[PDB]
């Protein structure tokens, strides 16, 4: 009725998004018009029940693919009443690094894999009490039994596009009712911001289909595929001719900090990077077995990007892209990614 | 077909809304054009069986009928001309009219809880319980929130009607929600919250969901349901306010019992006897938002009223004790 | 495709409507363009098996077929040219035509009750009962009202057809409703109520709901179903009316039995032998609205007729005894 | 295989029975052969988490395991040797032992109410209600009574165990029943009722029925649930009794509050403050059966105790105030 | 038809029993009459695909086949004559044979948890959870206990087979149970517990129930599942025992890690690194029953072993460290 | 009522049994008392439509009808007196009669697979699959095995009938089983296996389970279904046997193709062209049990025949090539 609804979305003290909505008097035209806000940090595992009580700083906003119209979704970062970034705010720390290395122009492209579930916490669409056929016909599948919940997956794609997210593509994965969507390329903090919104959209749209979304790295024990979030990386140098030079350089720095990265990179990733391997670091061209993979395409052309296949589906992009920049572009006395684990 | 439908909505002798609809010859452009009306007070627990009248008080576009169709909030007057037992709008109005100068503003945070057609908590495991509280507050994800589509429909409805609905959010207990309305001035708070409630019940009908304003729908550690009344006068809103805010809080401290007596039934299952206040304190009776405190002016949050409150009674007595009594009216007596 | 569908609706030898449809070459612009028609009276209990005719009486836009499609209310005439056993429109017409000058106005309050495809009360607990009466009258909220969407659809339908549908409301017994049609003049009351009924049955079809005009659908304390006929003549409507209102009420008091005899079957399960009247009196046979009384002119409410009444008979005999008999017609005899 | 199973049953720190079973080498022929035993009092709300003991008190044939298998009613003693918070059998015993000479007899009328696995009244219409009360009391016919087969199984069980179960009947509220145990002497009343309750819960398990000893399972006019304690001493039972019956009734009248304080929780939802008595009076606190009155001797009916009473407390304090206090024990204090 | 069926039951290369049946010409009267047998070790994870043998070790009446039909517990030996990877019965036997003189007795308390055909906790609310723990331990009443009939069937079965099954009880977590077997001597404990387990799985098949010996079937505060091993030697059982009991407890304290290493997988989700002991202490690693303590002789309870333990390994290493090692065998090495 | 029922069972022109029953005046005590009989060979694919005869061959107690009722295995002869296309019992008999002196013994291991009324694998996930093979072979526990009760009923049946049923076991593929019959002499092997099959189909009827003797019921890695024929002559069974065992194995190696041609249809989906032999070798065509090898005498296992084999053909040609051909009969020609 002349007014606008802004859904504030933020990240909690578990691995999830949270949101609430507020009416605004007028259409928004810049982040500056968006007010600070707050919530009960004790209901989200971010505060104690006194120094409890956390604040929301608008960071990005997009058209609401659900409410549509001039209604909007606002990505907000969590700051304690100190003014300090909450335990679970890692956007600030990463921002520091991206701001420092502005000049390198790091680009990221994440490949977000996820797995679909019943309202009853069983794999979505799988035979009651049993299993689908063995893997093989599901990857990039087409046909009634070959793919699950495509309509929900497509709705999400649409949503992301409407919001103007840099959603590059989508595909059905190897395990039945397991999917992927890719977002990129984004610069620095954008990668984190956009993937987090894409995730909000995913959860939220799936609600409408009674589907639960699982970012667990190994939703099903056994030979059923795990779920990763392959982080693709590049700096300005790597993108200009004679790049595999700096690509190779980066891969080597990366090889020295394998443990520090893995420590971010996702919980129970140990049931995925498994033997790819949790303790071993390797790299090579066209190698879906290595820790870092240089696309044959890149190799043949002498410039491009590399694929870090180590990060799990459940990673916090701020942490991954953050420490990636830290070790590829260089540390700062101003910030420590691995310490950002508070 | 050229004609208009007006749904008359009023408050009964239980804790509910009632309504009927009538055709009108032409589109309405002012409250003045809306006719008095009436109903059988004995079928709603407001009369004995030997007939009440409806005085249009506010009207809005009907979010359900849409078009030039309209919803009319009506107050109940007996054939005396006297306000029915359950009409507390009139009493409150007196106070608001007296203290016009102060310009009291209210913002209510209405919490409610969803239910089956079978009177079981909506969406809860059959015969059992969801996971324990924690992941539901402001939730997002399939199991984390219940009936969002209904909740959203309500939001939309309220906006269409032009209600001052400030926001919505999922609450701590699964299938428990909140919507906030404000700020409104004086009688508007009551009027608008009541309409928002009509819209809530009404829209939920379409989902087969019953709405519960009970203060403690589930015994145990499952959250209660409140209707936090936020309050401010012109003085409090201008710099150097926490002065008058503090003054108000103190007057309020002297009348804790009289307020509690309004403030909602079986609120006792949701401290009832203790009065306290403090900045950033979701434990106190009255809470001064840290934001307000840091800025020196604003409003305060009375966290005492239960979800099932009558806004006329709450906003009424709030004004009475914050702004000052009148020999012309007694809020606490308005309990007839 | 350039053509028009006209649904002919008529009244049968049970208490129901019947209909069939025919294509017409062109849009209709006056009753005169509508053709006579016919049907097998033996399949509707109006003829013996050795054929009845349909005389268009009124027509409206078809709320169901929409477009330039139309619904036609037809009266039943035997091959004699005589009005069928169950055509009481003609008899009544005589009276209305006689007393043209008085300008009788009617407003009927049609109550009805909803039912399963399985002939159980619609939406009621399986094998059991809802809570006891009280929260259903003018109800709002998920358990408080049944099939509102169907009821609304009907309201819309009537309005589209341009019927004089004045308002709707949920009644006292759960899944029992009312709609009001008025004011209509003379024969119009009958015509329009009958169409509204067609619309009701017809629209409810779409919800698998059966409509019951029985006066006492459930035995016990569950409310009955009436069709309160509201009445007024030109004199009663102009100041100093309650004079002629009172006069009418008295004439009515002398013909209580004759009226009751029309006024609906097993009305006895809904006092049948006593006649009384009084202002603001939902207990009397005729009720003068307090509003009317206070203002000195208006109308009166005859609370006697049952839900299942034939409006032609009620409005007919009402005129007969309020305005005056005719040697040209006998309402009570019209029972053939 | 030559061996015996003994199920030990005891009372917990909620209002329930608990049990476990143990193999015994040989058939049991006296209480003396039954071993002490124990359990984790912290898992039953009787100990803190830093262990309670079971003293065999009575034993009977197991109606469920049958054969030479047996059920053992055990009392709870802390490691002090002191009777647990919730062991009131010991305290009462003292009184019964003191007044051995009077030979108090009790007969309790245990009413209970049946429930779904889903905590809804057993067999009641889904989301709704049966017909109103009237046809259910001592009912017979398919709709008139609920779960008779379970009720009968329990009757059988009690008889097999050799309990003094005097009779059974269907109560006023649908799916509400009664069984009576008596007459029993002193401690036996408590022991046998508790076992009967074990048997009830246990047998109902087999029908997926939950048993409710709540005093008012359904709010409203639906009947509450009581445990009418019938009382008599040797004097009352011999001619010229209503003398001592009347005497007892008067002592009882002086200790109405002290009794009520035992007599069952939320009994307030089932008069609580008024004490009265009279012959053939289902309205009074104590009722003298017309039969007793006419014959001059017998017993009296205390209609005050609620369904959820602990027989040890009721029979205990009954004896205390009817037969006389002891410096050795205080029933009302036994509330630890 | 004159013939006998013997079901051979053995332990596999996962944590389960396996079995097949064979006809025998005549009733069996001693283990000596039972033939060796064999199976495809590659189908059970005990051989590579280039064949294991079954040596009858104990036999009982078949509670399922009944009659003169019999169940045969067989140990697995490779074609070397050597005990299979997963045969730990042989190693333990050595120790028991060595310390024949001490006459170790064991009593195991086997806890287990029930499951759907769909691998969800048996009987738990669909997608949700039962009420929180408290009312389930030794529960009685419809909601308080799950699948009692199956549990009872098992009890019966074990008794028929003549197993030393001492008792049964419902555990703290809903649909979690315990049965106790003892006291048994040396190798018997292992043999009998394994048979009891066969019976449990097998009988539950008939109720479509899966049995879980996992130590923590549900993450959170829901109880884990243990197999408390109770231990005693002849010395401990004769007066002045708590001497040797205390001695044993100390030896045990030195080998906490070595024991824990047997004692069950993911026992870590059920303190793992700390060793402690004390009288009446359900918190310690070893608990001396207050009863034992007060009487000066008896047994001790090792509360460390998890539900999924191999009794051969637990009782074996218990003897090794309590009674003394042998150069002839190493329990902790028996992990091949 | 004094009378007897004899069910005649025979083999048809598909791969199935057929049967009908007849009343007999008196209990049967020798095959001689059983009458010839007949049926419509055209309804079973054995005749053209221009009539076959049943010659009783063996009889047993009817495990289904019980009492003195009996099952009769009958062979099919055309009106010539010649053995039907599908009667291979006669041909085989010749060979067994010839080599009476050798006393061939057989033991068949009949594997089969269970199916829905809907032709889906019995008990398998709807539209999907169980876990991968491994836990099912000789399984025990709820998910590990399918329809054990049916399987057991069959075992019982076979025993009652007095068949030489040696044992049963659950196979590798879920809902796939085995039963073994042996040792039998010559024609008996065929007779008894065929009856066991009758019993299987018949008893399974009662569980709505279809039985599948197909060699590869599910394509893929799911196990096939075989009918391992175990063989031995008198010489092989007496010390120094593996001499003649080895001799037989070599003769068998020369006639691999001729055997395979019997041995079962689409056995190709279960090596078909390669012949090999070796001790303890579940990969070879013929396997000498390590047990036999170590002892120097015994039998050999031909692992080649498929589940769907005709035992008459297998045991027949086995004798033919192991014991020696006859000019009087040609097994491989017996394919008419």
How far CA F52 is from CA of F13, F14, F18, F198, F335, in Å, comes to 12, 15, 13, 20, 18
Among F243, F304, F236, CA closest to F276:
F304
Looking at the DSSP bridge assignments, the partners of residue C24 are C4
CA–CA separation, C310 and B278 (whole Å): 71
CB atoms within 10 A of CB F253: 14
Q: Are B275 and B282 in contact (CB under 8 A)?
A: no
A180 to chain F, closest Cα gap in Å? 24
Greatest Cα-to-Cα distance within chain F, rounded to the nearest angstrom:
59
Resolution for this PDB entry, in angstroms: 3.0
Angle at C94 between CA C93 and CA C99, to 5 degrees: 95
Torsion angles phi and psi, residue F131, rounded to 5: -60, 170
Please report where in the chains the tokens 């408050």 appear, as a residue. B11
- Name where chain B breaks: residue before each gap, C-N > 2.5 Å: 50, 270
DSSP string, E309-325: --HHHHHHHHHHHHH--
Pairwise CA distance, residues C228 & C212, whole Å:
16
Residue with tokens 């009663």: C236
* Helix (H) or strand (E) segment spanning residue A306: strand A306-308
* Domain ranges within chain D, ordered by starting residue: 1-85, 86-336
Nearest to B256 by CA among B277, B227, B233: B277
Question: Residue E11 and residue E54: Cα distance in Å, rounded?
Answer: 10
Give me the residue label for tokens 């921002």.
A95
Residue pair B135/B142 in contact (Cβ under 8 Å)? The answer is no
User: With contact defined as beta carbons under 8 Å apart, do D167 and D111 qualify?
Assistant: no
- What whole-number distance in Å separates Cα of residue D77 and Cα of residue D87? 7
Give the count of beta carbons closer than 10 Å to the beta carbon of residue A336. Answer: 15
The strand ranges marked E within chain B are 4-11, 17-24, 37-39, 52-61, 70-77, 105-115, 165-170, 176-185, 210-212, 227-232, 277-279, 286-288, 300-302
Strand bridging mode D210-212 / D227-232: unpaired
- Neighbouring residues of C218: CB distance < 8 A, sequence distance ≥ 6: C113, C121, C173
Residue C125, C-beta contacts closer than 8 angstroms, at least 6 positions apart: D125, D126, D127, D128, D129
DSSP code of E306? B
Neighbours of A100 (CB within 10 A): 17
Closest CA to D51 of D74, D75, D34, D76: D76
Q: What are phi and psi of E217, to 5 degrees?
A: -65, -30
User: Which pair of structure tokens corresponds to residue B190?
Assistant: 């009551």
Report d(CA B173, CA B144) in Å as an integer. Answer: 10
Residue B257 contacts A where some CB pair is shorter than 8 Å: no
Q: Give me F122's structure tokens.
A: 């019995």
- Calpha distance A15→A31 (Å, rounded): 26
Mutation pick from B118, B124, B218 vs chain D, by most beta carbons of D within 10 Å, is: B118
Select from B219, D204, D124, B132 the least CA-distant residue to E130. Answer: B132
Alpha-carbon distance values, D157 to A194, D66, D195 (Å) = 69, 10, 10
Contact yes or no for A307/A295 (Cβ under 8 A) = yes
CA angle B42, B44, B50 (to 5 degrees): 15
Whether residue D115 contacts residue D150, with contact meaning beta carbons closer than 8 Å, is answered with no
Answer for the pair E138, D18: CB distance below 8 angstroms, yes or no.
yes
Report the distance separating Cα D139 and Cα D168, nearest Å: 12
The structure was resolved experimentally with X-ray
Question: Residues preceding discontinuities in chain E at C–N > 2.5 Å?
Answer: 50, 270
- Shortest distance, CA C234 to any CA of chain B (angstroms): 21
How many Å apart are CA C123 and CA A177, to the nearest integer?
Answer: 39
Nearest to A39 among B138, B165, B280 (CB): B138
Alpha-carbon distances of B212 from B284, B314, F220, rounded to whole Å: 25, 19, 57
Closest CA to C137 of C129, C127, C145, C149: C145
Q: Please, which residues have CB within 8 angstroms of residue D226's CB and are 6 or more apart in sequence?
A: D109, D111, D215, D270, D303, D305, D306, D307
- How does DSSP classify residue C83? B
D129/C130 CB distance under 8 A: yes
Q: How far apart are CA C312 and CA C106, in angstroms?
A: 11
Crossing angle for the helix pair D148-161 and D187-205, to the nearest 10 degrees: 140
3-state secondary structure of F279: strand
Question: In the numeric block, which tokens belong to residue E5?
Answer: 């069926």
Q: Within a 10 A sphere around the Cβ of A116, how many other Cβ atoms? A: 24
Q: Compute the distance between CA of residue D196 and CA of residue D206 in angstroms, rounded to an integer.
A: 16
Interface of D with E in 105-164 (CB under 8 A): 115, 117
Interatomic CA distance for residues A241 and A304, integer angstroms: 8
Report the candidate in A229, A225, A248 with the shortest Cα–Cα distance to residue A308: A229
Query: What per-residue string of b and e applies to D179-203 under the rule 16 or more CB within 10 Å gives b?
Result: bbbbbbebbbbbbbbbbbbbbbbbb
DSSP character for F236?
H
Tokens of B3: 């004609």
HSE-CB of F16 using CA atoms within 13 angstroms: 12
Cα(C42)–Cα(A309) distance, integer angstroms: 83
> Is it the case that chain D and chain E have 3 or more CB pairs lying under 8 Å apart?
yes
Give CA–CA dist F199/F73, Å, rounded.
Answer: 12
Classify burial at C50, counting beta carbons within 10 Å of its beta carbon; exposed 0-12, middle 13-18, buried 19 or more.
Answer: exposed
Contact E140 D18 (CB under 8 A): yes
Sequence-separated contacts (24+) of A132-135 with Cβ below 8 Å:
A132/A176, A132/F128, A132/F129, A133/F128, A133/F129, A135/A174, A135/A175, A135/A176, A135/A223, A135/A224, A135/A225
> Which ranges in chain B belong to alpha helices (H)?
89-98, 148-161, 187-205, 234-237, 242-254, 256-261, 290-295, 311-323
In Å, what is the CA distance from B135 to each residue of A37, A216, B140, C175, E220? 20, 17, 9, 39, 15
**Contacts of E250 by beta carbon, 8 Å cutoff, 6+ apart:** none
The domain A88-342 having CATH identifier 1.10.10.10: the answer here is: no
Conformational region of residue F66, where left means phi above 0, alpha means psi within -120 to 50, and beta covers everything else = left
B42: helix, strand or coil: helix
Interchain CB distance below 8 Å, D129 and C125: yes
Residue E155, exposed/middle/buried by CB under 10 A (0-12, 13-18, 19+)?
A: buried
Q: What pairing do the DSSP bridges indicate for beta strands C37-39 and B105-115?
A: unpaired
| Euclidean distance between CA atoms E157 and E154, whole angstroms | 5
- On the CB side of A149, CA atoms within 13 Å amount to 30
Fill in the DSSP letter of residue A134: P
Here the tokens at position F132 are 């991968």
Question: Within 10 A of A240 (CB to CB), how many other CB atoms are there?
Answer: 11
- Nearest residue to A332 via CA among A87, A85, A95, A91: A95
Q: Which residues contact residue A83 at a Cβ distance below 8 angstroms, ignoring those fewer than 6 apart?
A: none
Decide the pairing of beta strands B286-288 and B300-302. antiparallel
**Chains touching E, CB cut-off 8 Å, 3+ pairs:** A, B, D, F
User: Judged by CB atoms within 8 Å, which residues 21-40 of A form the interface with B?
Assistant: 21-23, 38-40
> What distance in Å separates the CA atoms of residue B309 and residue C293, rounded to the nearest whole number?
38
Question: From 3.10.20.70, 3.50.50.60, 3.40.50.12780, 2.40.50.140, which CATH number describes the F1-85 domain?
Answer: 3.10.20.70
Q: Please compute, for residue C81, the number of CA atoms within 13 A of its CA located in the half-sphere on the CB side.
A: 0
Which residue in the block uniquely carries the two structure tokens 């690693």? E285
What does the DSSP 8-state code read for residue B50?
A: -
Tokens 């779409």 belong to which residue? C206
Q: How far apart are CA D224 and CA B139, in angstroms?
A: 42
Segments in A136-295 forming alpha helices (H)? 150-162, 189-207, 236-239, 244-256, 258-263
Residues after which chain A is discontinuous, using a C–N cutoff of 2.5 Å: 275
d(CA B225, CA B308): 8
Closest CA to D24 of D9, D7, D12, D6: D6
Q: Are C21 and C35 in contact (CB under 8 A)?
A: no
- Closest to B197 in 3D by CA, of B40, B45, B73, B88: B73
Q: C-alpha distances in angstroms, D89 versus D71, D162, D194, E326?
A: 18, 21, 11, 55
CATH 3.30.590.10 describes domain C86-336? yes
- The number of C-alpha atoms within 13 Å of D147 and in the hemisphere containing its C-beta is 30
What is the rounded CA–CA span in Å between residue A272 and residue F234? 60
What is the residue whose two structure tokens read 């507020």? A22
Other C-beta atoms closer than 10 Å to the C-beta of F109 total 22
Q: CA of E3: how far to CAs of E26, F66, F165, in Å?
A: 6, 18, 10
CATH topology of domain A1-87: Ubiquitin-like (UB roll) (3.10.20)
Count of CB atoms within 10 A of residue F266's CB?
Answer: 12
Q: What torsion, rounded to 10 degrees, do the Cα atoms E72, E78, E82, E85 define?
A: -90
D contact chains, 3+ CB pairs < 8 A? B, C, E
Tell me, yes or no, whether chains A and D touch by having 3 or more C-beta pairs under 8 A. no
- H or E element at residue C196: helix C187-205
- Find the length of chain B: 336
Q: Degrees (nearest 5) of the Cα angle C220, C222, C227?
A: 115
The C-alpha atoms of residue F155 and residue F63 are separated, in whole angstroms, by 10
Contact F61, F5 (CB under 8 A): no
Q: How far is CA D208 from CA D125, D176, D178, E132, E142, in A?
A: 17, 16, 19, 20, 5
Using a 10 angstrom Cβ sphere, with 0-12 exposed, 13-18 middle and 19 or more buried, the burial of residue F312 is: buried
Q: Assess contact for D284 and D278: CB atoms under 8 A.
A: yes
DSSP A301: H
For helices B89-98 and B187-205, what crossing angle results, to 10°?
140
d(CA B90, CA B191): 12
E20, E43, E211: residue with CB nearest F172:
E43
Q: Between A317-329 and A244-256, two packed helices, what is the crossing angle to 10 degrees?
A: 110
The label of the residue with tokens 């009621």 reads: C124
Q: State yes or no: chains D and F have 3 or more CB pairs below 8 A.
A: no
For an interface test with F, give the residue of A127, A132, A135 to mutate (most F CBs within 10 A): A127
- Both tokens of F72, joined, read 């009769």
Give the span between the Cα atoms of C136 and B235, in whole angstroms. Answer: 46
């Amino acid at each position: 009725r002349g007014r606008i609804i802004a859904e504030y979305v933020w990240i909690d003290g578990t691995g999830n998004l949270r949101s609430k909505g507020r009416t605004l008097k007028k259409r928004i035209t810049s982040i500056d018009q968006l007010p600070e806000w707050n919530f009960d940090g004790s209901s989200t595992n971010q505060a104690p029940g006194h120094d409890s009580d956390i604040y929301l700083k608008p960071v990005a906003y997009y058209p609401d693919p659900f409410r549509r119209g001039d209604n909007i979704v606002v990505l907000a970062a969590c700051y304690n009443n100190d003014g300090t970034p909450n335990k679970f705010n890692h956007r600030h720390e990463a921002a520091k690094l991206f701001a420092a290395h502005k000049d390198e122009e790091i680009w990221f492209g994440l490949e977000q894999e996820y797995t679909l579930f019943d309202m009853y916490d069983d794999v979505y669409g799988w035979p009651k009490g049993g299993y689908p056929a063995p893997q093989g016909p599901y990857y990039c599948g087409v046909g009634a039994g070959k793919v699950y919940a495509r309509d929900m997956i497509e709705a999400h794609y649409r949503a992301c596009l409407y919001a103007g997210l840099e959603i590059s593509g989508i595909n059905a994965e190897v395990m039945p009712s397991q999917w992927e969507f890719q977002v990129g390329p984004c610069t620095g903090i954008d990668m984190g911001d956009q993937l987090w919104m894409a995730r909000y959209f995913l959860h939220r749209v799936a609600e409408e289909f009674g589907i639960k979304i699982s970012f667990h790295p190994k939703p099903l024990k056994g030979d059923w595929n795990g779920a990763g979030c392959h982080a693709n990386v590049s700096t300005k140098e790597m993108r200009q001719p004679g790049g595999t030079k700096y690509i190779e350089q980066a891969i080597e720095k990366l090889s020295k900090r394998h443990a520090e990265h893995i420590k971010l990179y996702g919980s129970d990733n140990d049931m995925r990077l498994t033997g790819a391997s949790m303790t071993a670091f390797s790299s090579g061209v066209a190698n879906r077995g290595s820790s870092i993979r240089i696309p044959r395409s890149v190799a043949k052309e002498g410039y491009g990007y590399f694929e870090d296949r180590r990060p799990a589906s459940n990673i916090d992009p701020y942490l991954v892209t953050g420490i990636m920049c830290e070790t590829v572009c260089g540390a700062i006395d101003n910030a420590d990614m691995t310490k950002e684990f508070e």
